[PDB]
Every structure is written in structure tokens, then in C-alpha cells.
Structure 1
Amino acid sequence: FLSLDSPTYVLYRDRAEWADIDPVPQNDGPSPVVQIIYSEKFRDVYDYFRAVLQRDERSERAFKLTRDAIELNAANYTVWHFRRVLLRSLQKDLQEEMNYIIAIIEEQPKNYQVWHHRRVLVEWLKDPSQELEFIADILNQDAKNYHAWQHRQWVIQEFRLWDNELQYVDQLLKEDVRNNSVWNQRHFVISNTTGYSDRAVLEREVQYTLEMIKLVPHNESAWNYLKGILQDRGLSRYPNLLNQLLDLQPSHSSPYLIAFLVDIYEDMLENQCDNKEDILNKALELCEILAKEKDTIRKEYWRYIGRSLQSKHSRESDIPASV
């Protein structure tokens, strides 16, 4: 019970209670490569970890040792595995272990091993009562923590805690409407609850998005979300969309709106629309405007779409060579 950062911390080779153990130095071989020059503390802890692991000593002192080994390198999955073995062998109180992992995660939230460890605990305990709140705290420090959102989806799905997520999503979108992780969480909650086939729901969503797009014309998340929820059924399936977007170019324009226009035209041409050729040319001029002025960083992409659209929608596209 002596923190790795305690001022009175003592190396393991200097601890009475560990006198019986011979540390097992690391087998790096005769002439090492990518050899890390560990600090005295690090090498000391791992020399003893190697010993306990080797003897597969399932003891209370081994358990405490893993805490130090983990703190020195939370990414050492071999140590996490041994710790889980000890948690079961020693019948350790898992809520106390839950207390421990939330502290570690708060400290190193961008580590794979700490989140996986917490998931295992939640599973063992079959108790998700603390998950949404804990994750909310992590997210409150980094609204985009990938592991946090992944854990949150798992917990919500595995335990069916859908009831308040949409509300949570609305809270974070308000805080930062540009948070792409929240737009993803939104699509996550809806897809698994009401789904987007419910016309009232889909309608609501597009209304909301367009509303957001009006407020922040250049935020790409809203735009990608809008394309995402309509692209599967087909953009041309929604005739009023086009006109409503065109009524934004005046003021609320962006290379995003132009790109959407092309998308709509592309789908239209893909479903034999009226005035096929007129639509095509409208798209080819937008592709060029984007590739040479509005969105040049993507010039290669836009020129490709330009070719594609003509390669298969020009009036001569389905006309015999000899004609």
C-alpha cells in the first residue's frame, strides 16, 4: 500500500517482505535491439513482476505489485491479464477494483487496456449503474474520446439504456454542434430505437439538421449527417431537398452545399430523372467550380466524379459506336 509516486516509495529489492523472491531480469539476449534504458524504478518493478508471473504466485503482494507495474506502463496487457487472474483467485472486491479503474482511466483516458479492463469488470458484476455518469465525466474533459464513446455504446446496447441518450446527445450538440462524435452517437441512438423509416422521425431529423446547417453553414458534421440519413433511401427520392438547398446558396453557401448538390444530381441521373442532360451539365459545372475554385484540395476527386458522371450519363453514353 505504497503509491508509485509516494515520496517514501522504496524499490522492491529493498523491501523486507520481498526478500524471499529472486527478481527475474529481462531476457533481452546477447545483443539487444530497440533496448529501452529503463529507470531504476521501472526495471525494479518489472524484475519482480517477471518473478511473480513466472512462479504464477497468486498472492496479495503480487496483486499490489501489478498496480505499480500498471502505473509504470498501463499499456502492458500481460500485466492486466495477470491482475485479472489475481482478482478472481484472491476473490477481490470488484467494486473496490471499479474504484481503482475509474481513477486510472481519469488519469490515462486514451489507453486501450484500461477501458477493456473496466468492461470486464462491468460484465463480471453485471452492473452498469455507474457507467453513463462516469463516461459523462470523462467526456466532459474530452468530448471526443474514442474509447469513451465506444464504451458508452457497448454499455447502452448490452444493457439497453437508450431512454436518455438522445437527451444527452442534444446536450453535447448544444455545447459543441461541431462534435462529430455526438452526431455519430445521435445516429446510433436513433438507428437502434425508432429507426429512420418512421417518416415523422426522419422528418424531425432533417429539420433539425437543416436548422443547424443554417446556424453554422460551414460545419461539415451537420452536412455529413444530413447526407447519411437520406443517402440510403436515395437522395433523388426527396424532390424538395434540392430546391431547399438552392435557397441557401445566396447566403448560407459553402463548398459543402455545392458538393451536396452534385450528390443529389448524381443520384437523380442514377434514376433517369426529367431533363437528364440539363441536370448533368449542372453537375459538371459544379464539379469544376469545386475542383478549380471552391474545393481545390479535392481537385482529383471532383475531376473523377466529373468523368464518372459523363462516362455514364452523357446523351451519347448508351449510343452505339457506329451511330
Structure 2
Amino acid sequence: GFLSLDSPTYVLYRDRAEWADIDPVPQNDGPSPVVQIIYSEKFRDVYDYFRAVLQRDERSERAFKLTRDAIELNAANYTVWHFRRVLLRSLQKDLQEEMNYITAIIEEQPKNYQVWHHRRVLVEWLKDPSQELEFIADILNQDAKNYHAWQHRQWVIQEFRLWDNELQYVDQLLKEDVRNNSVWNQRHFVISNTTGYSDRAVLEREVQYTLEMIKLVPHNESAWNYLKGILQDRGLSRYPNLLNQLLDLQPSHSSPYLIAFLVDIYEDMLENQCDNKEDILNKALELCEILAKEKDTIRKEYWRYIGRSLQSKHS
């Protein structure tokens, strides 16, 4: 019998008969309280009673129902969440009903840490990941960048080995918003944990896919960071055609990302004994000044450092 904390007929615990035996334990804030919260009547009521059942380690069905109210009053109280998991095991509660519960609270507080960790503990206990990818997709449908949702998704996929359809899901979300960096991250997570980027066809597929995206939305930093990320491995200079291919978007799709990418390719050519070293150095130093002075001034101190550093190296 869950009398909702929001129920118009909700009554304070101290006014409840089935609780009349127990004496509520108030909070010990000391004689000279600091950062002391002037709790509401309800909050203060539920917690004084929570303290009482916890202090006597009373593992009852009534205590279990109470933690729910204390969680709803403050979902970040990890001590309450802990005692709740204690009661889930002692009382041998139906963990599937608890999944329904945690599904509801997460929808309400998708950015709370405790709610997600609890769901994880439930999935571990039941060794059942069947509802996970779908539940998470519903959270990401509301906020496609929820960090906890993405973390949970990554944990479920790696733990239960659910890799088969993730690249497709990633393609789906990239269509919705090609600027969703969380999705570019998921793309790399899936690939690196399945085929890897050493497979030349995959690498080629990924570099071409990314280049088409850069063509469509040239100022999307994610696509640029992903391009640099997957090639940076072997070294950007290892790919001779790339420089030319980017130098071609120089007039058309030319953002300060293309410029910065060119200095990156240059930095690596210099480090890898490239031909035309003096020539290459000047180009890279020219771009560092255009960036520092004109195209990307917010990063002036960074680009100057790159300038200095580059001279100091290949002078």
C-alpha cells in the first residue's frame, strides 16, 4: 500500500498508526549548526523516521516502503539507497518490480548518479540485460547526450556482449544530429571493440564517411575531432593523399578546423623526416599565425605555443 508522497491524502509518519510504536530519531547537527537546512515538515518527518529504522537496523516491509519516500525527497542520499538495497535482499523483494520502480525514477531524474548505479546493481543481480538497450534509448530520445545513459549503455554492451546492433543505432542518431559528440564517441567505442581501426577497409570506410560529413557541415567540430582521432593513431603523415584532399576544401569547406588540421598534419610530417622541411615548417608557422592573429584568436596563446614549439624543434 504505497501512499504516494505526492498524494493529496498523504499523512505524516508521526500521524501514522502502523508506525506509532517507533520513536523518530532527529538529526544531530551539533549545538552550533553550520550549513544547516531548514527542512520542511514532510522532509524532516520522513528522515527522522528513516534514522530510527536505520539505527535499529529494522529490516521491515514498512522500512522498505519508507526508504522510497526518503529517496523521493532526496534521490542523492546514497545512505538511503544503500539501506534500500539491504532490504531488497533481506525481504527478498521481486527485483523485476524494483526495475519498474527504478525505470520510473530515472525517467524523472535522469541525471542523478544513484538512480543509475541502482539500476546497474539490479541488472547484475538478475543477470538480465534484456530491457536495457531499449530503456536507455528512451532516455536518449529525451536527452541524446545524457552522460549516465551513455555510460550505462557502454557497460551493458561490454558486459553482456550486445555489440551487433550498436553501429546501426549510432548511424540512426548521427542522422538526427551529426553534431552529437556523444554519438561520435559511441561510434569509436563500438568500432574499436569490434573490428578495430587497423582493418584497412574499416579505416577507409570511416575516413570516407567522416569526410562526407565534413562536406555537409564543415563547421562541425565532432567530425573533425573524430577524423583526427582515428588517423592520429598511426600518425597523420602516414597518409599522403589526405593533406591534398583537405587542401582542396581550402576555398570551399574551409573552417578554422581545416586550418588547424593542416598544422596537425604538418607537425607530424616534420617529426617524421618529411621532404621540403623548411618549406613545410613555414606553411605550418604561417597557419599558426593566421590562426593566432585572425581565424582562431580565442586560442591565440595555444597557437603561439605551437608556433614557438615548432620552431624550437625543426628550426
Name the TM-score class by shorter chain. over 0.9
In structure 1, the residue matched to 2:228 is: 227
Once residues 277 and 73 of structure 1 are traced to their aligned partners in structure 2, the CA distance between those partners, rounded to angstroms, is 63
Once residues 293 and 23 of structure 2 are traced to their aligned partners in structure 1, the CA distance between those partners, rounded to angstroms, is 70
Is 1:151 aligned to residue 145 of structure 2?
no
> Which runs of structure 1 show a deviation greater than 6 angstroms over 4 or more consecutive aligned residues?
none
Q: How much does 1:257 deviate?
A: 0.4
Q: How much does 1:163 deviate?
A: 0.2
User: 1:97-126: CA deviations, max 9, x gaps?
Assistant: 000000000000000000000000000000
Q: How much does 1:178 deviate?
A: 0.2
Q: How much does 1:51 deviate?
A: 0.3
Once residues 278 and 265 of structure 1 are traced to their aligned partners in structure 2, the CA distance between those partners, rounded to angstroms, is 10
Once residues 278 and 165 of structure 1 are traced to their aligned partners in structure 2, the CA distance between those partners, rounded to angstroms, is 45
Q: How much does 1:171 deviate?
A: 0.3
Once residues 9 and 297 of structure 2 are traced to their aligned partners in structure 1, the CA distance between those partners, rounded to angstroms, is 60
Once residues 3 and 255 of structure 1 are traced to their aligned partners in structure 2, the CA distance between those partners, rounded to angstroms, is 55
Once residues 312 and 189 of structure 1 are traced to their aligned partners in structure 2, the CA distance between those partners, rounded to angstroms, is 37
In structure 2, the residue matched to 1:198 is: 199
Q: Superposition pairs for residues 121-136 of structure 1, below 5 Å?
A: 121-136=122-137
Once residues 285 and 131 of structure 2 are traced to their aligned partners in structure 1, the CA distance between those partners, rounded to angstroms, is 54
User: 1:294-315: CA deviations, max 9, x gaps?
Assistant: 00000000000000000010xx
Once residues 254 and 66 of structure 1 are traced to their aligned partners in structure 2, the CA distance between those partners, rounded to angstroms, is 54
User: 1:7-64: CA deviations, max 9, x gaps?
Assistant: 0000100000000000000000101000001110000000000000000000000000
Once residues 302 and 296 of structure 1 are traced to their aligned partners in structure 2, the CA distance between those partners, rounded to angstroms, is 9
Once residues 272 and 312 of structure 1 are traced to their aligned partners in structure 2, the CA distance between those partners, rounded to angstroms, is 12
Once residues 153 and 22 of structure 1 are traced to their aligned partners in structure 2, the CA distance between those partners, rounded to angstroms, is 45
User: 1:188-223: CA deviations, max 9, x gaps?
Assistant: 000000000000000000000000000000000000
Once residues 6 and 290 of structure 1 are traced to their aligned partners in structure 2, the CA distance between those partners, rounded to angstroms, is 60
Once residues 39 and 62 of structure 1 are traced to their aligned partners in structure 2, the CA distance between those partners, rounded to angstroms, is 21
| Partner secondary structure for residue 33 of structure 1 | coil
Which ranges in structure 2 are unaligned for 5 or more consecutive residues? none
| Partner secondary structure for residue 134 of structure 2 | helix
* TM score, norm. by length of structure 2: 0.99
Once residues 151 and 144 of structure 2 are traced to their aligned partners in structure 1, the CA distance between those partners, rounded to angstroms, is 12
User: 1:202-252: CA deviations, max 9, x gaps?
Assistant: 000000000000000000000000000000100000000000000001110
Once residues 4 and 196 of structure 1 are traced to their aligned partners in structure 2, the CA distance between those partners, rounded to angstroms, is 52
Matched length: 313
Q: Superposition pairs for residues 292-307 of structure 1, below 5 Å?
A: 292-307=293-308
Once residues 164 and 5 of structure 1 are traced to their aligned partners in structure 2, the CA distance between those partners, rounded to angstroms, is 40
Q: How much does 1:275 deviate?
A: 0.3
Once residues 203 and 11 of structure 1 are traced to their aligned partners in structure 2, the CA distance between those partners, rounded to angstroms, is 65
| Partner secondary structure for residue 248 of structure 1 | coil
Once residues 7 and 247 of structure 1 are traced to their aligned partners in structure 2, the CA distance between those partners, rounded to angstroms, is 67
Once residues 203 and 7 of structure 2 are traced to their aligned partners in structure 1, the CA distance between those partners, rounded to angstroms, is 56
Q: How much does 1:83 deviate?
A: 0.2
Could you tell me the percent identity over the aligned residues? 100
Which ranges in structure 1 are unaligned for 5 or more consecutive residues? 314-323
Once residues 51 and 206 of structure 2 are traced to their aligned partners in structure 1, the CA distance between those partners, rounded to angstroms, is 55
Once residues 33 and 307 of structure 1 are traced to their aligned partners in structure 2, the CA distance between those partners, rounded to angstroms, is 51
Q: Superposition pairs for residues 65-80 of structure 1, below 5 Å?
A: 65-80=66-81
* Two-structure CA RMSD over aligned residues (Å): 0.3
Once residues 200 and 226 of structure 1 are traced to their aligned partners in structure 2, the CA distance between those partners, rounded to angstroms, is 15
Once residues 313 and 188 of structure 2 are traced to their aligned partners in structure 1, the CA distance between those partners, rounded to angstroms, is 33
Q: Superposition pairs for residues 134-173 of structure 1, below 5 Å?
A: 134-173=135-174
Once residues 262 and 40 of structure 2 are traced to their aligned partners in structure 1, the CA distance between those partners, rounded to angstroms, is 59
Once residues 253 and 4 of structure 1 are traced to their aligned partners in structure 2, the CA distance between those partners, rounded to angstroms, is 57
* TM score, norm. by length of structure 1: 0.97
| Partner secondary structure for residue 298 of structure 1 | helix
| Partner secondary structure for residue 63 of structure 1 | helix
User: 1:130-149: CA deviations, max 9, x gaps?
Assistant: 00000000000000000000
Once residues 311 and 42 of structure 2 are traced to their aligned partners in structure 1, the CA distance between those partners, rounded to angstroms, is 67
Once residues 251 and 204 of structure 1 are traced to their aligned partners in structure 2, the CA distance between those partners, rounded to angstroms, is 23
Q: How much does 1:253 deviate?
A: 0.4
